[PDB]
Amino acid sequence: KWEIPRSEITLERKLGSGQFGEVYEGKWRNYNIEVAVKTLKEGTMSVEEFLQEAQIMKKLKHPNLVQLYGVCTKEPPIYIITEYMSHGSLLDYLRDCVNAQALLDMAAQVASGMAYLESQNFIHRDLAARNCLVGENNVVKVADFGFPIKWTAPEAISYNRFSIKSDVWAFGILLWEIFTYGQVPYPGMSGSEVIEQVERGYRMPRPQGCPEEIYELMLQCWNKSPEERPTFAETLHALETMFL
Numbered sequence: 481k482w483e484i485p486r487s488e489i490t491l492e493r494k495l496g497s498g499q500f501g502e503v504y505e506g507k508w509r510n511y512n513i514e515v516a517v518k519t520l521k522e523g524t525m526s527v528e529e530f531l532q533e534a535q536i537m538k539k540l541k542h543p544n545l546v547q548l549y550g551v552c553t554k555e556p557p558i559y560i561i562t563e564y565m566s567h568g569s570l571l572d573y574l575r576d577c578v579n580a581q582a583l584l585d586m587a588a589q590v591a592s593g594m595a596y597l598e599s600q601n602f603i604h605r606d607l608a609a610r611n612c613l614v615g616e617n618n619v620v621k622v623a624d625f626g627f628p629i630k631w632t633a634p635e636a637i638s639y640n641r642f643s644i645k646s647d648v649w650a651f652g653i654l655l656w657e658i659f660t661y662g663q664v665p666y667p668g669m670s671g672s673e674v675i676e677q678v679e680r681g682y683r684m685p686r687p688q689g690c691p692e693e694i695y696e697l698m699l700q701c702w703n704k705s706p707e708e709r710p711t712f713a714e715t716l717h718a719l720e721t722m723f724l
């Protein structure tokens with residue numbers, strides 16, 4: 481049902497690479513549309529486990545989550561195909577320097593996609609600006625491509641206790657990357673310093689020009705106790721109800 485015949489897809493550019501496979505921009509000849517194409521490097525893992533990513537994705541449908549288009553699974557190399565986002569990663573897009581209202585809009589869209597995931601009983605586990613994509617009209621979508629200490633909540637580092645609340649922690653960090661135009665967090669600090677300082681109560685200070693109301697939401701995301709962090713639903717309402 482999600483099988484696409486392989487001849488319909490034409491590869492055009494290497495986007496990124498790795499150890500389980502690579503990703504390309506391609507063209508889908510039928511729809512006259514650009515696609516992203518993720519490939520299985522044979523023998524780096526099973527075909528079955530590669531396609532478990534596509535299985536999850538068939539259950540999810542939301543304007544701020546990357547849409548699966550289909551798979552090519554009849555022979556190697558196995559493909560998972562999604563929409564292509566014209567402006568690439570949020571992080572790269574922020575790094576070209578917009579208004580605080582537009583930065584807010586982008587944050588809301590991520591929260592929106594996360595809220596949907598939460599509602600469907602999934603966790604991300606790797607939320608970060610590098611993992612969100614930008615299209616036209618400032619549309620933002622959450623993706624997962626795919627340490628990393630600086631995005632990972634304390635209980636996750638210490639007890640391997642990942643949860644939707646550890647995701648809320650990472651969204652606080654992402655909020656900070658957004659409102660700094662994509663700076664690397666905890667500037668200068670190494671990982672072990674970050675783990676130690678954070679444990680003792682350290683939080684990044686408010687970025688230059690960032691609204692206090694926005695900064696206050698980041699602090700709520702970074703509560704030391706996970707049960708006291710806001711839900712993603714709560715988080716979206718908070719963002720929509722900031723004005724100016």
Ligand SMILES: Cc1ccc(NC(=O)c2ccc(CN3CCN(C)CC3)cc2)cc1Nc1nccc(-c2cccnc2)n1
Nearest residue numbers: 503516517518546560562564565568602603604605623624
């Ligand atoms: C080609 C592909 C294959 C798979 C995916 N997968 C996902 O984006 C994804 C998102 C959410 C989940 C759900 N979630 C994962 C976390 N776990 C714990 C459970 C639930 C799963 C996969 C995206 C894509 N798209 C993709 N991948 C890399 C780069 C790009 C890309 C780059 C530049 C411009 N446009 C697109 N696009």
